[PDB]
């Protein structure tokens, strides 16, 4: 029966099942949306204690299939799935969107033939990730899954003779498997005949049904989960570049599991739960030895999160599902719709307190979110408290993540300038070969960094559809042996690729110690992509082809000194020393930002101080001239981007300086519904 | 003055230009399009010993930049170039294209300042490739280059003063440069104020004009050589998903240069000359000792071509020229032009001839372009003598290549069934650490061959516009701890991006001995793209989700064995051995390509020696019908893929059997102008 004396009723016994997954360590999945409702709930305490929620503020739907394959929403009891996927409708309002927003969440029911894909899986799957599209609506996706489903034509086991080389001697091989009449007719009457492919023979004596392939009555057995799990990858590939995915593993993804997880490319992964190809006992089986003991070691988080296959780690299903709640706080409600603004007590109007030094090491994600103190907190460029970094356990040389900028969200990528001790682990299957340790060094890409700081920008882009800043301070690339042979050309290209289809605002931004020098200023450029970026140097940044080091050993060599010294030595060799120290000066200063602005290859020299203040508003007027350009670029006589952004411009009043962030973003706030009716005026001019 | 007496001319004197470009081993820059001739002039004798070209056949004219910055022809003397960008526009008639064909090479003038990038090369460069584009016309880069342009203020050197802490006693340190009045003049007299930014002072007695920040007057000192060279970075990315791009490295590309050779992607490397990013001697002075000898060491062929950022290497720039003239003799004229058939001595209409057995070991490229032998040639699939293989040695696990069926020149990939020896060097910079050897078996995915299959599947589709046969035949990914760190998930996914992409017709062909299992099925899947993917087995294929051996090792268990023993055994533990093979076989009999047909997830069952006479119409019918559904698209109510061809073949005649690929290819091409009557007769009725 049950445990006996509960006060409330045993629900683990109402429906074994919720058992069922329990012990094997996840969620049953349908109490998601609960755990999603918990979560909601916190969002709200964090922003304002003292708002007053009721339960109209969360709702889930079941989402399933009717009678003509269309998806409906039901209430029923959990546990009467038919197939092994499940989804929900999500409606919740946020901080972010307190009238509400939605999504879908699709989930492997792991207590449903060990949640493996068959083929009515993967067209239900198909179908959910097909109507979050449609709606531009986010996508969950819960993974816990075996991967494909294997099968075999059970009708047949007990029914097929073999025709022996020789009997009373099986010994000595077989020519091939067959049935009987009696065999035909147990599978006629089990209305199945088209279960096998046979050919008539008679043997001396009795008639025999040649098994010439055996097709099976259950569908589910082999390749028609093949087809069915290539729809589904087609169809992540397709929903990452329309709406934002994102995925919970959540006891384990296996096979089209793992690369669904990939696919959807935003991943958490649940301390303990592997994300696996096969497992360890089908790879030892392979090898022929006992080499890898559990699949942790194949698809656990020191690997996956590693990776950067994983962008963060949860330490149990609630936290992963606090982790997608609080991702999901950046992005819009749904495709092309404004980034959602939400601004906290951390309000535009302030200068940035926390300060690089020179000679002083510091931790970059104090410029961004500020840092804890002794003697308080000092604020950095962004609001306090904002700053959500993802991929956090790979490529520590970038940091990427996303915060606000007085409540406008953003995604953000700073170079980390301490050294990165990288360790990689020995492979067990190589009999002998020892753990190695990586040196990576500060400000310098290599092929990792380069290619996280690719992957960071295509996931801003891509259903975030966030703006960007690059808080860029590169030394350059990692050029020796092993980094060329481990393609730093290669990675570092996807990030001008990036660059390249990057849809909303980016400033790139040099700061106060920092530096850009030749390629890691080339990849970073605005005329890579003149239409959404721009740059600024701090007034105590630098930037140049070469460091100083490198300019004088080249430009400013023996010869030159010595020549130096017979006209500032009225004496006029032991003056090397300061000589070389003179020409280093030299150098520098024609690596200063003053420069920059002269050669026009920047849009502004900032004081760190009030750089939050200056983005601020320059971001503000930036999304609403782009809103405005969008507007009309769905015209008909369609225009260059230049000829569009200069008759947007040809409306803000005579008085308007267009130079003045502030004024042009509160002049077309004040007037959305006038420039509105300026379109609506163009629209009929625009048949012609 | 010469060497004496020579019969014609001493061109290295009448242009000594030429003799600095030979110096450095490479062919001076206006010498390339004599190159050109001279390949395509092989190209002709390869074709067709006996025809009879003039000089007329092809033309090569300087582009240069007019009066208003417009790109024009001239025909001018060799050397005349006054920035070290050079640029030609050649109309060459080839075999594919008889009446002629177009194309831009540019290329770095090593002669020029070293071949290095300054604003005006690179702006130059950037017109080039934008002249190239708008015609749709492939892009030829040359490079051979010292990257980005170094510089100083020259001017300022014999200046600058230096405000000593103590003179006598330079030693201490000092305080900050300046000028004087008469340091301020020589600057107005040679008009160049704009040199520095100062500040008035006056320290006892004098007047000091304290430098601030050094511009300099000559442009191309430091961060303009970068904006440059963002822009061509970003110019070259554009280009390859927009025209034929294609690279020759010819005496060596630095910087800027080694990434403009990734950025458009098909690069040939000549033997001994360097794709780097900085120098041996450069980054020794980084490190503090001599660990490099040569660049040679950085980015020779050993690591370029090892990498997969090499496609081809040459044994010299003639043998360079040629293979670009080759590989593009598959490429269309301009983009969106028709793919260039092509039919030679070996027509469409003959059985293949080589084929793999089960036993005995082969090399996938006698199946795909056949096999001298002891008796003679043996056909395979596709024209002999056609198969151009690129990317030669990276990821030797698979193999790609263009080539020709009957004529239609398309992308091909087949899997190498080898084990490969790949073999990693020591890195000269690691204290020890020695070479190291892998191991990667036959028919399996690693990252590598995952990254080299979405690589070449992206570079059919993106200037060779061609259509793709993939002949699959992957057991699987491998999925073992080294594999799985090192991302076999990350590169797997690009193989299923690049597919969706994908814009030409695509066969996948599992062939006579092959197999494609799990996961290697699903990344391949037509379901990805149902627009233009189709799949074949061959009757002696095999395909499902496990092997026979891991599919007996779960569902036909001890238990499952006895009780058959117990039903087949008149006598019923000394059966295993036998029983074990019986049930290996049933298993077997599940992955018949018959019952890839009884689920519908594969179009026909082929048989290889049919195969060529089978794919060749395939995809004629295709190419056909695809040009009407493009006619077709371009109309104004658009529509489902679906509902197009649904109506094009609305137009064949009753009679014409839809399924007969010969019948419907052949009377589309006797009506393509009737076709075309009926468009021109649709246009019409569709304004409203
Ligand atoms: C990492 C090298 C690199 C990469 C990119 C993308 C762009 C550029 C041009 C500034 C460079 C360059 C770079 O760092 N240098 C180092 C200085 O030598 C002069 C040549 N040079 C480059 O051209
Ligand atoms: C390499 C594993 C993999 C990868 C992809 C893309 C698709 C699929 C589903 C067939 C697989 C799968 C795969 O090979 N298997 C191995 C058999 O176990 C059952 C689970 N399984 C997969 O789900």
Not at 8 to 18: A, D, F, S
Not at 106 to 117: E, L, P, R, Y
Not at 435 to 464: C, Y
Not at 488 to 516: C, N, R
Request: with cysteine; proline share 5%; aromatic share 10%.
């Amino acid at each position: 029966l049950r445990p006996i004396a509960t006060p409330y009723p045993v629900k683990e016994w109402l429906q074994p099942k919720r058992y069922k997954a329990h012990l094997m360590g996840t969620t049953y999945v349908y109490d998601f949306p609960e755990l999603f409702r918990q979560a909601s709930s916190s969002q709200w305490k964090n922003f304002s204690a003292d708002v007053k929620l009721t339960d109209d503020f969360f709702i889930s739907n079941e989402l399933i299939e009717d009678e003509n394959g269309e998806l409906t929403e039901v209430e029923r009891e959990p546990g009467a799935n038919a197939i092994g996927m499940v989804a929900f409708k999500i409606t919740v309002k946020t901080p972010e969107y307190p009238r509400g927003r939605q999504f879908v969440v699709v989930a492997n029911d792991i207590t449903f033939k060990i949640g493996s894909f068959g083929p009515q899986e993967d067209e239900f799957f198909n179908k959910v990730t097909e109507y979050a599209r449609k709606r531009g609506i986010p996508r969950i996706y819960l993974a816990a899954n075996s991967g494909a489903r294997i099968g075999m034509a059970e009708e047949i086991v007990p029914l097929f003779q073999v025709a022996w080389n020789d009997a009373a001697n099986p010994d000595k091989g077989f020519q091939y498997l067959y049935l009987t009449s009696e065999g035909m007719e147990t599978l006629k009457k089990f209305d199945k005949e088209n279960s096998v492919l046979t050919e008539r023979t008679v043997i001396n004596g009795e008639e025999r049904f040649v098994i010439k392939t055996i097709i099976g009555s259950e569908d589910g057995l082999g390749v028609e989960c093949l087809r069915g799990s290539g729809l589904i990858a087609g169809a992540t590939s397709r929903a990452y570049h329309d709406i934002f995915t994102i995925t919970l593993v959540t006891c384990r993804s296996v096979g089209i599991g793992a690369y669904l997880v990939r696919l959807g490319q935003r991943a958490i992964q649940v301390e303990g739960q592997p994300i696996i190809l096969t497992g360890a006992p089908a790879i030892n089986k392979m090898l022929g030895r006992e080499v890898y003991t559990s699949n942790l070691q194949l698809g656990g988080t020191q690997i996956m999160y590693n990776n950067g296959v994983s962008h963060l780690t949860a330490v149990d299903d609630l936290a992963g599902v606090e982790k997608i709640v609080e991702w999901m706080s950046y992005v819009p409600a749904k495709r092309n719709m404004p980034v959602p603004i939400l601004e906290t007590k951390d309000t535009w109007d302030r200068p940035v307190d926390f300060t690089p030094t020179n000679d002083e090491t510091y931790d970059v994600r104090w410029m961004i979110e500020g840092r804890e103190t002794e003697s308080g907190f000092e604020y950095g460029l962004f609001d306090k408290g904002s700053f959500f970094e993802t991929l956090s356990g790979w490529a520590k040389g970038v940091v990427v993540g996303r915060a606000r900028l007085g409540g406008i969200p953003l995604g953000v990528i700073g170079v980390e300038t301490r050294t990165v001790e990288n360790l990689i682990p020995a492979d067990p299957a190589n009999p002998n070969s020892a753990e190695t340790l990586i040196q990576e060094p500060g400000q310098v890409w290599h092929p990792n960094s380069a290619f996280k700081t690719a992957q960071a920008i295509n996931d801003f882009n891509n259903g975030e559809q966030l703006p960007m800043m690059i808080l860029a301070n590169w030394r350059g690339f990692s050029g020796g042996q092993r980094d060329m042979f481990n393609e730093v050309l290669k990675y570092g290209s996807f990030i001008v690729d990036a660059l390249v289809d990057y849809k909303q605002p980016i400033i790139i931004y040099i700061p106060p110690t920092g530096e850009l020098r030749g390629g890691s200023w080339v990849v970073v450029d605005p005329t890579i992509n003149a239409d959404q970026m721009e740059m600024y140097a701090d007034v105590n940044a630098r930037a140049g082809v070469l460091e100083p080091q490198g300019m004088v050993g080249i430009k400013f060599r023996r010869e030159k000194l010595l020549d130096t010294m017979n006209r500032l030595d009225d004496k006029y060799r032991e003056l090397l020393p300061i000589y070389g120290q003179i020409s280093l000066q030299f150098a520098d200063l024609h690596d200063r930002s003053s420069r920059m602005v002269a050669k026009g290859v920047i849009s502004k020299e900032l004081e760190w101080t009030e750089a939050r203040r200056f983005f601020f508003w320059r971001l503000r007027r930036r999304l609403n001239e782009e809103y405005l350009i969008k507007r009309l670029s769905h015209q008909v006589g369609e225009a260059s981007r230049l000829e569009k952004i200069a008759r947007i411009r040809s409306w803000y009043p005579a008085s308007v300086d267009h130079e003045d962030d502030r004024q042009v973003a509160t002049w077309i706030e004040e007037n959305y519904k006038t420039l509105d009716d300026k379109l609506k005026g163009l629209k009929l001019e625009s048949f012609a």
